[PDB]
Amino acid sequence: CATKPAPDFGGRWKHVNHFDEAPTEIPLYTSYTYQATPMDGTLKTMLERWAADSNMQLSYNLPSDYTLIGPVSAISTTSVQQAATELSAVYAAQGVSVSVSANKLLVQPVP
Amino acid sequence: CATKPAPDFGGRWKHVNHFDEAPTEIPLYTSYTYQATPMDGTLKTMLERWAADSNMQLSYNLPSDYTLIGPVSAISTTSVQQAATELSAVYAAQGVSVSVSANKLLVQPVP
Amino acid sequence: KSGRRPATLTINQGTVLNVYVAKDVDFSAVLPK
Amino acid sequence: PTLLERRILAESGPVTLAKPISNPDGLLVRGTY
Amino acid sequence: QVVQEYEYAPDRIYQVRTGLGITTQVELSPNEKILDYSTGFTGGWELTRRENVFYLKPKNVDVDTNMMIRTATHSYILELKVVATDWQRLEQAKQAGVQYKVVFTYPKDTSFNNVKNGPLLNAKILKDRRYYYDYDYATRTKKSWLIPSRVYDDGKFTYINMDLTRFPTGNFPAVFAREKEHAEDFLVNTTVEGNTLIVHGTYPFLVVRHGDNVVGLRRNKQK
Amino acid sequence: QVVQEYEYAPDRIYQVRTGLGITTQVELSPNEKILDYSTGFTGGWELTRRENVFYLKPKNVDVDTNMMIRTATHSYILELKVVATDWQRLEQAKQAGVQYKVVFTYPKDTSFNNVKNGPLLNAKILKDRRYYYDYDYATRTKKSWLIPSRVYDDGKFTYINMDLTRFPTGNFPAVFAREKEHAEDFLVNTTVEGNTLIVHGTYPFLVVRHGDNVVGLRRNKQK
Amino acid sequence: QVVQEYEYAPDRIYQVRTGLGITTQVELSPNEKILDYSTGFTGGWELTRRENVFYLKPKNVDVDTNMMIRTATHSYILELKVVATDWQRLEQAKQAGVQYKVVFTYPKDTSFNNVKNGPLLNAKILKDRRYYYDYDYATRTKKSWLIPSRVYDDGKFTYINMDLTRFPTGNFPAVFAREKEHAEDFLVNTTVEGNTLIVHGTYPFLVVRHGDNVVGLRRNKQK
Amino acid sequence: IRCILETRIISDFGGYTSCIVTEPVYSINGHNLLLPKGSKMLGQYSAGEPTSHRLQVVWDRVTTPTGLDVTLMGPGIDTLGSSGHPGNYNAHWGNKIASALF
Numbered sequence A, B: 001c002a003t004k005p006a007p008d009f010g011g012r013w014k015h016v017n018h019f020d021e022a023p024t025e026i027p028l029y030t031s032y033t034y035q036a037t038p039m040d041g042t043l044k045t046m047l048e049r050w051a052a053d054s055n056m057q058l059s060y061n062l063p064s065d066y067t068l069i070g071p072v073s074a075i076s077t078t079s080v081q082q083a084a085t086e087l088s089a090v091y092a093a094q095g096v097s098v099s100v101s102a103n104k105l106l107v108q109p110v111p
Numbered sequence C: 001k002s003g004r005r006p007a008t009l010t011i012n013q014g015t016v017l018n019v020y021v022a023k024d025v026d027f028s029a030v031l032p033k
Numbered sequence D: 001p002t003l004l005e006r007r008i009l010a011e012s013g014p015v016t017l018a019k020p021i022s023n024p025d026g027l028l029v030r031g032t033y
Numbered sequence E, F, G: 001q002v003v004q005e006y007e008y009a010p011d012r013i014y015q016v017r018t019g020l021g022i023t024t025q026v027e028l029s030p031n032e033k034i035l036d037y038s039t040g041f042t043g044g045w046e047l048t049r050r051e052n053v054f055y056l057k058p059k060n061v062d063v064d065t066n067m068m069i070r071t072a073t074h075s076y077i078l079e080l081k082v083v084a085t086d087w088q089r090l091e092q093a094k095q096a097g098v099q100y101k102v103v104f105t106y107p108k109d110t111s112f113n114n115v116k117n118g119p120l121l122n123a124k125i126l127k128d129r130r131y132y133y134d135y136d137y138a139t140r141t142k143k144s145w146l147i148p149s150r151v152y153d154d155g156k157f158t159y160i161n162m163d164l165t166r167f168p169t170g171n172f173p174a175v176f177a178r179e180k181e182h183a184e185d186f187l188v189n190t191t192v193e194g195n196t197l198i199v200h201g202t203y204p205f206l207v208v209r210h211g212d213n214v215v216g217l218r219r220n221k222q223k
Numbered sequence H: 001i002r003c004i005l006e007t008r009i010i011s012d013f014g015g016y017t018s019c020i021v022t023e024p025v026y027s028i029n030g031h032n033l034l035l036p037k038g039s040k041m042l043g044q045y046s047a048g049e050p051t052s053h054r055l056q057v058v059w060d061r062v063t064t065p066t067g068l069d070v071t072l073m074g075p076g077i078d079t080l081g082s083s084g085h086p087g088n089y090n091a092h093w094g095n096k097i098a099s100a101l102f
Helices: A043-052 A080-090 B043-052 B080-090 D004-010 E090-096 F090-096 G090-096 H093-101
Strands: A025-027 A057-060 A097-100 A104-108 B057-060 B064-066 B097-100 B104-108 C008-011 C016-019 D018-020 E003-007 E013-019 E024-027 E034-039 E045-049 E053-058 E065-071 E075-084 E101-105 E150-153 E157-161 E174-178 E190-193 E196-200 E205-209 E214-218 F003-007 F013-019 F024-027 F034-039 F045-049 F053-058 F065-071 F075-084 F101-105 F150-153 F157-161 F174-178 F190-193 F196-200 F205-209 F214-218 G003-007 G013-019 G024-027 G034-039 G045-049 G053-058 G065-071 G075-084 G101-105 G150-153 G157-161 G174-178 G190-193 G196-200 G205-209 G214-218 H002-005 H016-021 H033-035 H040-044 H058-063 H068-070 H074-077 H088-090
Touching: A043 A057, A043 A104, A080 A097, B043 B057, B043 B064, B043 B104, B080 B097, E013 E024, E013 E053, E034 E045, E034 F053, E045 E065, E053 E065, E053 E075, E053 G034, E075 E090, E157 E205, E174 E196, F013 F024, F013 F053, F034 F045, F045 F065, F053 F065, F053 F075, F075 F090, F157 F205, F174 F196, G013 G024, G013 G053, G034 G045, G045 G065, G053 G065, G053 G075, G075 G090, G157 G205, G174 G196, H016 H058
Parallel strands: A057 A104, B057 B104, E003 E101, E013 E075, E024 E101, F003 F101, F013 F075, F024 F101, G003 G101, G013 G075, G024 G101
Antiparallel strands: A025 B064, A097 A104, B097 B104, C008 H088, C016 H002, C016 H074, D018 H068, E024 E053, E034 E065, E045 E053, E065 E075, E150 E157, E157 E196, E174 E205, E190 E196, E205 E214, F024 F053, F034 F065, F045 F053, F065 F075, F150 F157, F157 F196, F174 F205, F190 F196, F205 F214, G024 G053, G034 G065, G045 G053, G065 G075, G150 G157, G157 G196, G174 G205, G190 G196, G205 G214, H002 H016, H016 H040, H040 H058, H058 H068, H058 H074
């Protein structure tokens, strides 16, 4: 009928201040990785935040907008040219070509 | 049903004011021992507090930072040159060379 | 005499409590500008 | 009178606050054991 | 210049510059009660108080004096001056250098300063924040209007987003949180921006309720 | 010079220098109640009191006198002067040598002085302090968010550090202490700096609780 | 020009221009209580207050001053002027630039502005709104006067229309709503325009009652 | 404000409590950190006969690690929002019987 006390510990007594054996290399100077979040829904809203997060201009010259699909979630590059190449390989069935004219992004149909 | 009193002592009656037989030598002039605490996590934060606790300058010239590993916890020297030698023997697999140019520490890759 | 003793209720020393604030507190004279 | 000579003449439940803590180097605060 | 702020430091001489037909108010802290005050040359200054504010005005051209206010824990030494007395147009007292209002700012102790980049809650995706897009959902009904559209977090706030379940206008839930899968849930602080429900803090489980129908939300474990 | 501190010694003549249109306050101790006071030449000094502070101002050019304050356990002999009387600008009374405020500092007895190097609690590792990095932990769950990252002490404070269990934002415990392993725990005084929980005093065991889950902390014995 | 609105910003100098035989009222917010106020050169301004409004009028030709109002959470610095004093015709004080009324508009905080095209409820069919014409009805009696003529919605309001059941003049129901087909119904907010009953919000089921006779309304599922 | 209790409350005489805050508490819209992670909330309760199996504490001061001293009015609630903190009721029938049986 008495009062149940607080919980009590118990175990192995591992030691806290433990050095490891693998020298994990923490980078100091991290660049910007062009990638595809699930938040930005369509292709236009993803390229509006690649141009904003890199100080470039977006010239979206398509009459309609496409949503993001499965194979878009594999682009992870610190280079804008290699990310625009991997993007245009995905949206090749709809005639979408994305290229960089050295200061801005161009979204035009394929010739 | 009565009241439980205070605890009472009991034992052997050893004597308090006891001289020993080993003349333990207490040092008077203690220098600074270069060693590796568990608190400073990475290699850069350990050398920022060796330079601060010895009035030297740190020139960390690596693009990335390494965490402290197991064999780092054996350096205990009152000499900066013998501690930078034992450190560079540990981080030889990653191309890290630490030396002292007589007034400052240099962290550069190995030639 | 033993009917004059009240009952107790204890709350142990680790239990996660929770506090409902019931009036507004203005921190604007503290936060850096 | 004038303009200068006239101005001489014609004129003759609880509260909830969040303040910074005061002198913490010598404070024995409410709640030490 | 016109409304001047001073920073409170102990035993500092604060200069208050007044004009002849102009009220100047000094405003102390609302926290402490004013014990007493005394100005030299009392018959040359018409000053009244309302619980922390002193409305000062001089009475003659040379009434320069001090005034000392002593509250429960602060002590002020004001240095009263008269700088505009001959003005006809009220812009001339501005240029002479009167002070309409005086307020005191109170810093915290410098031992806590030994212990900023925009707001902490920003519903957009920032350049320099780390996000975690790995969340699940579990519910009885297959296609419900209570299933969130997108759930993620920035390490400090969990951003539940529900702006694609468009049809029922009354579809907005109450979000709880839970430490295990079938433990007892507890309360979180939430702020909302449109259709995004933002939960203050990252949790292992979130529980989303709208009456008899409930949707759980597991954060998957970092592999 | 302007605000002057005096050190209280029994039967010392303290000089208070006033000006003609300037209040000077003397501030006694807040501890003791003022019994009585009497100044010579009463009709040349307008002085009022508010429970420990006397606001002094003269009335004519030659009103030099003494004033004696007698509290319950202290006795003051003030030597009132008039040093600035002809000033037109209030900076001229500063240079003449008036005193806006007078406060008394009260030392302790010199028999206790027969019985400093920075602060006692410093979370960094200092050059000249001895640290003890030998602590264990024991808990039921293998990988918990309640396990401390680093635990050490400087002989006077135990520095529990928890800044690598990054994920749960509500992970901050209540630290107790214990004299044996499975004895009954008691209370400690704690201060915190960021994610470091600092416990006032070194103990054989520390107990870390966050509800139903608990982590013990043994200090290992000095070999 | 004659009735002037100011936007409230903290520590701004608001100019109030008065005339010699003309009341000017300033109108503060009805929400907060006025603590205190003080104008310089009090004997040149006849001003009275009624709980948030100050009726100002000067008394002589050169009474230019400030006035400071301090409420519980706002602080106003008014800059009182005299601009018309010699007028015989009251149109001459209009052209001189007096202000009959002064009112303050209070914006919300700019952190909420980071979070318009006509009215939201428009019973006509607009060019740029999406409508959903797919609704059913179920009732016991075959030809009733309680069956709606046309039911549709614009995504935000459900427009029940009953203007072809012309005969019974007392045919106007009370509309409820329901989440399942035979669940328990609840309450909605309704506004009405003629014979159109407009329900605030889109629901899966609507229930239409006039006593003992009832008509259900299913919204069919989007294929 | 979620806090975890530090002083074991026993409803006999009515005294003073202290709980350590466990989760940081932000603004109304999250732009600022108001109460940091390790603050102490300070409260007090009153003696009474515990008819209901809950205790009623009025928490009325927080002292933050960043050097603040707030004086809010917060009644203590359950972890789901019910008014009053639940406890472990104990009518002492071990001592009431043994003093009058023997």
